[PDB]
Protein backbone atom coordinates (compact mmCIF):
# COMPACT_ATOMS: atom_id res chain seq x y z
CA UNK A 1 0.00 0.00 0.00
CA UNK A 2 3.01 2.25 0.64
CA UNK A 3 4.11 2.36 -2.99
CA UNK A 4 0.51 2.38 -4.24
CA UNK A 5 -0.44 5.62 -2.50
CA UNK A 6 2.99 7.07 -3.27
CA UNK A 7 2.34 6.42 -6.94
CA UNK A 8 -1.19 7.82 -6.62
CA UNK A 9 0.20 11.05 -5.15
CA UNK A 10 2.82 11.44 -7.88
CA UNK A 11 0.54 10.45 -10.78
CA UNK A 12 -2.13 12.91 -9.64
CA UNK A 13 0.53 15.61 -9.34
CA UNK A 14 1.61 14.86 -12.91
CA UNK A 15 -1.97 15.28 -14.15
CA UNK A 16 -2.19 18.62 -12.34
CA UNK A 17 1.13 19.53 -13.98
CA UNK A 18 2.25 20.89 -10.61
CA UNK A 19 5.89 20.61 -9.55
CA UNK A 20 7.31 19.71 -6.14
CA UNK A 21 8.86 23.16 -5.83
CA UNK A 22 5.47 24.79 -6.41
CA UNK A 23 3.79 22.96 -3.53
CA UNK A 24 6.00 24.46 -0.82
CA UNK A 25 7.92 27.69 -1.38
CA UNK A 26 8.78 27.72 2.33
CA UNK A 27 9.32 23.97 2.50
CA UNK A 28 8.69 24.19 6.23
CA UNK A 29 5.54 22.06 6.42
CA UNK A 30 6.87 19.67 3.77
CA UNK A 31 10.56 19.12 3.13
CA UNK A 32 11.15 18.34 -0.55
CA UNK A 33 13.25 15.39 0.62
CA UNK A 34 10.21 13.90 2.37
CA UNK A 35 7.87 14.02 -0.64
CA UNK A 36 10.50 12.58 -3.00
CA UNK A 37 11.09 9.72 -0.55
CA UNK A 38 7.32 9.19 -0.26
CA UNK A 39 6.88 9.03 -4.03
CA UNK A 40 9.68 6.45 -4.11
CA UNK A 41 7.42 4.32 -1.91
CA UNK A 42 10.27 3.60 0.48
CA UNK A 43 8.66 5.63 3.27
CA UNK A 44 5.10 5.49 4.58
CA UNK A 45 3.47 8.93 4.24
CA UNK A 46 2.48 10.08 7.73
CA UNK A 47 -1.17 11.09 8.13
CA UNK A 48 -0.27 14.78 8.49
CA UNK A 49 1.40 14.62 5.08
CA UNK A 50 -1.72 13.10 3.53
CA UNK A 51 -3.81 15.94 4.94
CA UNK A 52 -1.48 18.57 3.48
CA UNK A 53 -1.03 17.11 -0.01
CA UNK A 54 -4.81 16.76 -0.33
CA UNK A 55 -5.51 20.23 1.05
CA UNK A 56 -3.24 21.66 -1.63
CA UNK A 57 -4.52 19.35 -4.37
CA UNK A 58 -8.00 20.78 -3.87
CA UNK A 59 -9.31 17.24 -3.50
CA UNK A 60 -10.55 15.59 -0.30
CA UNK A 61 -8.66 12.70 1.30
CA UNK A 62 -11.83 10.61 1.16
CA UNK A 63 -12.85 10.55 -2.51
CA UNK A 64 -9.55 9.48 -4.09
CA UNK A 65 -8.52 7.08 -1.32
CA UNK A 66 -12.01 5.56 -1.25
CA UNK A 67 -11.50 4.88 -4.96
CA UNK A 68 -9.15 -2.23 -1.89
CA UNK A 69 -12.57 -3.23 -3.25
CA UNK A 70 -14.24 -6.58 -3.89
CA UNK A 71 -14.93 -7.42 -7.57
CA UNK A 72 -18.54 -8.01 -8.62
CA UNK A 73 -17.61 -11.27 -10.36
CA UNK A 74 -17.16 -12.99 -6.99
CA UNK A 75 -20.76 -12.25 -6.02
CA UNK A 76 -21.87 -13.81 -9.31
CA UNK A 77 -20.04 -17.01 -8.37
CA UNK A 78 -21.39 -16.76 -4.82
CA UNK A 79 -24.90 -16.48 -6.24
CA UNK A 80 -24.22 -19.70 -8.14
CA UNK A 81 -23.29 -21.34 -4.83
CA UNK A 82 -26.32 -20.54 -2.69
CA UNK A 83 -29.19 -19.75 -5.07
CA UNK A 84 -28.96 -23.09 -6.88
CA UNK A 85 -30.42 -26.02 -4.88
CA UNK A 86 -28.62 -29.28 -5.66
CA UNK A 87 -30.86 -31.55 -3.57
CA UNK A 88 -27.87 -33.80 -2.87
CA UNK A 89 -27.43 -34.66 -6.54
CA UNK A 90 -24.18 -36.40 -7.52
CA UNK A 91 -23.07 -34.02 -10.27
CA UNK A 92 -24.74 -30.84 -9.01
CA UNK A 93 -22.58 -30.81 -5.87
CA UNK A 94 -19.32 -31.72 -7.63
CA UNK A 95 -19.88 -28.76 -9.94
CA UNK A 96 -20.19 -26.49 -6.90
CA UNK A 97 -17.16 -27.95 -5.11
CA UNK A 98 -15.19 -27.33 -8.31
CA UNK A 99 -16.56 -23.79 -8.19
CA UNK A 100 -15.50 -23.25 -4.57
CA UNK A 101 -11.93 -24.21 -5.44
CA UNK A 102 -12.16 -21.78 -8.36
CA UNK A 103 -13.37 -19.05 -6.01
CA UNK A 104 -10.47 -19.85 -3.67
CA UNK A 105 -8.07 -19.86 -6.62
CA UNK A 106 -9.34 -16.44 -7.69
CA UNK A 107 -10.42 -14.43 -4.62
CA UNK A 108 -8.70 -15.97 -1.57
CA UNK A 109 -6.74 -12.84 -0.64
CA UNK A 110 -9.36 -10.12 -1.04
CA UNK A 111 -12.36 -11.51 0.85
CA UNK A 112 -13.02 -10.55 4.50
CA UNK A 113 -12.46 -13.27 7.13
CA UNK A 114 -16.23 -13.66 7.53
CA UNK A 115 -16.59 -14.41 3.82
CA UNK A 116 -13.89 -17.09 3.87
CA UNK A 117 -15.72 -18.50 6.88
CA UNK A 118 -18.95 -18.60 4.87
CA UNK A 119 -17.22 -20.45 2.03
CA UNK A 120 -15.59 -22.95 4.39
CA UNK A 121 -18.72 -24.00 6.29
CA UNK A 122 -21.07 -24.73 3.38
CA UNK A 123 -18.20 -26.56 1.66
CA UNK A 124 -18.34 -29.06 4.53
CA UNK A 125 -22.12 -29.25 4.13
CA UNK A 126 -21.86 -30.02 0.41
CA UNK A 127 -19.19 -32.67 0.92
CA UNK A 128 -21.16 -34.08 3.85
CA UNK A 129 -22.19 -37.74 3.65
CA UNK A 130 -23.36 -39.20 6.96
CA UNK A 131 -22.98 -38.81 10.73
CA UNK A 132 -20.81 -41.90 11.18
CA UNK A 133 -18.16 -41.03 8.60
CA UNK A 134 -17.65 -37.35 9.42
CA UNK A 135 -16.40 -35.35 12.45
CA UNK A 136 -18.76 -33.61 14.88
CA UNK A 137 -19.69 -29.93 14.64
CA UNK A 138 -17.72 -29.20 17.81
CA UNK A 139 -14.50 -30.92 16.71
CA UNK A 140 -14.26 -28.69 13.63
CA UNK A 141 -15.63 -25.52 15.26
CA UNK A 142 -15.49 -25.71 19.07
CA UNK A 143 -15.18 -21.96 19.63
CA UNK A 144 -17.89 -20.99 17.13
CA UNK A 145 -20.40 -23.62 18.25
CA UNK A 146 -20.23 -22.58 21.91
CA UNK A 147 -20.87 -18.96 20.94
CA UNK A 148 -23.95 -19.59 18.80
CA UNK A 149 -25.61 -21.57 21.59
CA UNK A 150 -25.53 -18.54 23.88
CA UNK A 151 -26.05 -15.85 21.24
CA UNK A 152 -29.44 -14.21 20.69
CA UNK A 153 -29.14 -12.98 17.10
CA UNK A 154 -27.42 -15.16 14.50
CA UNK A 155 -25.64 -14.01 11.35
CA UNK A 156 -25.49 -15.75 7.98
CA UNK A 157 -22.44 -17.75 9.08
CA UNK A 158 -24.04 -18.80 12.36
CA UNK A 159 -27.01 -20.26 10.49
CA UNK A 160 -24.59 -22.28 8.36
CA UNK A 161 -22.76 -24.00 11.23
CA UNK A 162 -26.10 -24.68 12.92
CA UNK A 163 -27.22 -26.22 9.63
CA UNK A 164 -24.12 -28.42 9.66
CA UNK A 165 -25.04 -29.35 13.23
CA UNK A 166 -28.37 -30.61 11.86
CA UNK A 167 -26.75 -32.77 9.17
CA UNK A 168 -24.69 -34.54 11.83
CA UNK A 169 -27.83 -35.26 13.84
CA UNK A 170 -29.96 -36.99 11.19
CA UNK A 171 -30.73 -40.67 11.69
CA UNK A 172 -28.88 -40.44 14.98
CA UNK A 173 -30.35 -41.36 18.35
CA UNK A 174 -28.46 -40.82 21.62
CA UNK A 175 -28.61 -37.03 21.33
CA UNK A 176 -28.92 -34.04 23.65
CA UNK A 177 -32.58 -33.07 23.22
CA UNK A 178 -32.23 -29.85 25.22
CA UNK A 179 -29.47 -28.34 23.07
CA UNK A 180 -31.60 -29.17 20.04
CA UNK A 181 -34.78 -27.62 21.43
CA UNK A 182 -32.92 -24.51 22.59
CA UNK A 183 -31.49 -23.93 19.12
CA UNK A 184 -34.76 -24.48 17.25
CA UNK A 185 -36.32 -21.91 19.57
CA UNK A 186 -33.67 -19.27 18.86
CA UNK A 187 -33.94 -19.98 15.12
CA UNK A 188 -37.70 -19.43 14.95
CA UNK A 189 -37.38 -16.11 16.79
CA UNK A 190 -34.97 -14.73 14.19
CA UNK A 191 -36.44 -11.78 12.30
CA UNK A 192 -36.43 -12.11 8.51
CA UNK A 193 -34.16 -9.49 6.89
CA UNK A 194 -33.88 -8.26 3.30
CA UNK A 195 -30.61 -10.11 2.69
CA UNK A 196 -31.02 -13.12 0.39
CA UNK A 197 -28.14 -15.18 1.79
CA UNK A 198 -29.50 -14.99 5.35
CA UNK A 199 -32.95 -16.18 4.29
CA UNK A 200 -31.47 -19.00 2.22
CA UNK A 201 -29.30 -20.03 5.18
CA UNK A 202 -32.29 -19.75 7.51
CA UNK A 203 -34.37 -21.78 5.05
CA UNK A 204 -31.79 -24.59 5.08
CA UNK A 205 -32.02 -24.69 8.88
CA UNK A 206 -35.83 -24.72 8.98
CA UNK A 207 -35.94 -27.53 6.43
CA UNK A 208 -33.33 -29.39 8.47
CA UNK A 209 -35.24 -28.80 11.71
CA UNK A 210 -38.44 -30.26 10.27
CA UNK A 211 -36.37 -33.05 8.71
CA UNK A 212 -35.00 -34.23 12.05
CA UNK A 213 -38.44 -33.74 13.60
CA UNK A 214 -40.05 -36.15 11.15
CA UNK A 215 -37.32 -38.78 11.48
CA UNK A 216 -37.50 -38.65 15.29
CA UNK A 217 -41.31 -38.51 15.09
CA UNK A 218 -41.35 -35.30 17.14
CA UNK A 219 -43.93 -32.72 16.07
CA UNK A 220 -43.52 -29.95 18.64
CA UNK A 221 -44.09 -26.50 17.11
CA UNK A 222 -44.21 -28.13 13.68
CA UNK A 223 -46.88 -25.65 12.61
CA UNK A 224 -44.61 -22.83 13.76
CA UNK A 225 -41.72 -24.12 11.63
CA UNK A 226 -43.76 -24.15 8.42
CA UNK A 227 -45.26 -20.74 9.22
CA UNK A 228 -41.67 -19.47 9.35
CA UNK A 229 -40.88 -21.19 6.05
CA UNK A 230 -43.88 -19.66 4.28
CA UNK A 231 -43.14 -16.27 5.83
CA UNK A 232 -39.58 -16.46 4.50
CA UNK A 233 -40.79 -17.38 1.01
CA UNK A 234 -43.37 -14.56 1.03
CA UNK A 235 -40.72 -11.98 1.93
CA UNK A 236 -37.88 -13.44 -0.14
CA UNK A 237 -40.04 -14.46 -3.12
CA UNK A 238 -38.19 -17.78 -3.26
CA UNK A 239 -41.06 -19.62 -4.96
CA UNK A 240 -38.51 -22.16 -6.18
CA UNK A 241 -38.29 -23.42 -2.59
CA UNK A 242 -42.06 -23.80 -2.11
CA UNK A 243 -42.16 -27.40 -3.42
CA UNK A 244 -40.02 -28.38 -0.42
CA UNK A 245 -42.63 -27.13 2.03
CA UNK A 246 -45.30 -29.20 0.28
CA UNK A 247 -43.10 -32.24 0.89
CA UNK A 248 -42.97 -31.40 4.60
CA UNK A 249 -46.74 -31.01 4.87
CA UNK A 250 -47.01 -34.34 3.06
CA UNK A 251 -44.97 -36.45 5.47
CA UNK A 252 -46.62 -34.64 8.38
CA UNK A 253 -50.18 -35.39 7.31
CA UNK A 254 -49.02 -38.94 6.57
CA UNK A 255 -47.28 -39.66 9.88
CA UNK A 256 -48.87 -37.37 12.48
CA UNK A 257 -52.48 -37.19 11.27
CA UNK A 258 -52.22 -40.62 9.64
CA UNK A 259 -53.88 -39.12 6.58
CA UNK A 260 -53.16 -40.41 3.08
CA UNK A 261 -55.80 -38.39 1.23
CA UNK A 262 -54.12 -35.08 2.03
CA UNK A 263 -50.64 -36.60 2.07
CA UNK A 264 -51.01 -37.60 -1.58
CA UNK A 265 -52.26 -34.18 -2.67
CA UNK A 266 -49.29 -32.50 -0.98
CA UNK A 267 -46.92 -34.76 -2.89
CA UNK A 268 -48.95 -34.06 -6.03
CA UNK A 269 -48.61 -30.28 -5.71
CA UNK A 270 -44.86 -30.71 -5.22
CA UNK A 271 -44.44 -32.95 -8.27
CA UNK A 272 -46.42 -30.50 -10.40
CA UNK A 273 -44.33 -27.58 -9.16
CA UNK A 274 -41.13 -29.53 -9.82
CA UNK A 275 -42.42 -30.02 -13.37
CA UNK A 276 -43.20 -26.38 -14.17
CA UNK A 277 -39.77 -25.41 -12.85
CA UNK A 278 -38.31 -27.79 -15.45
CA UNK A 279 -36.12 -29.27 -12.71
CA UNK A 280 -35.52 -32.87 -13.77
CA UNK A 281 -33.51 -34.08 -10.77
CA UNK A 282 -36.00 -32.46 -8.37
CA UNK A 283 -39.04 -34.08 -9.98
CA UNK A 284 -37.64 -37.62 -10.15
CA UNK A 285 -36.51 -37.46 -6.51
CA UNK A 286 -39.66 -36.02 -4.94
CA UNK A 287 -41.89 -38.48 -6.79
CA UNK A 288 -39.62 -41.32 -5.70
CA UNK A 289 -40.30 -40.32 -2.10
CA UNK A 290 -43.99 -40.57 -2.93
CA UNK A 291 -43.63 -44.21 -3.95
CA UNK A 292 -41.29 -44.78 -1.00
CA UNK A 293 -44.08 -43.72 1.36
CA UNK A 294 -46.43 -46.26 -0.22
CA UNK A 295 -48.22 -43.91 -2.61
CA UNK A 296 -48.94 -43.73 -6.34
Amino acid sequence: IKDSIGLRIKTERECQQMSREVLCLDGAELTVRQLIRIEKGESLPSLDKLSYIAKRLGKSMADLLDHIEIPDTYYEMKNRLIKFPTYGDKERVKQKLDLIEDVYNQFFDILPEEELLTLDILENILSFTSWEERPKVEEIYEDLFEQVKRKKKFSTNDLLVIDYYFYHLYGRKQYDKKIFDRIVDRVLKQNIPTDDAYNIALFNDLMAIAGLKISLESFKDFLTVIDKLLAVIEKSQFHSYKPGVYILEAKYELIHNGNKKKATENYDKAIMFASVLEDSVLEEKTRAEKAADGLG
Binding site: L81, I82, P85, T86, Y87, G88, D89, V93, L122, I125, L126, F128, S130, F166, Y167, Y170, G171, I200, F203, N204, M207, A208, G211, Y241, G244, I247, L248, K285, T286, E289
Partner: peptide, 8 residues
Protein backbone atom coordinates in the same frame (compact mmCIF):
# COMPACT_ATOMS: atom_id res chain seq x y z
CA UNK B 1 -29.77 -37.14 5.06
CA UNK B 2 -32.81 -36.77 2.76
CA UNK B 3 -32.53 -34.87 -0.54
CA UNK B 4 -34.99 -32.13 0.45
CA UNK B 5 -32.75 -31.05 3.32
CA UNK B 6 -29.93 -29.96 1.01
CA UNK B 7 -31.03 -26.60 -0.38
CA UNK B 8 -27.42 -25.68 -1.10
Amino acid sequence: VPFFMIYY
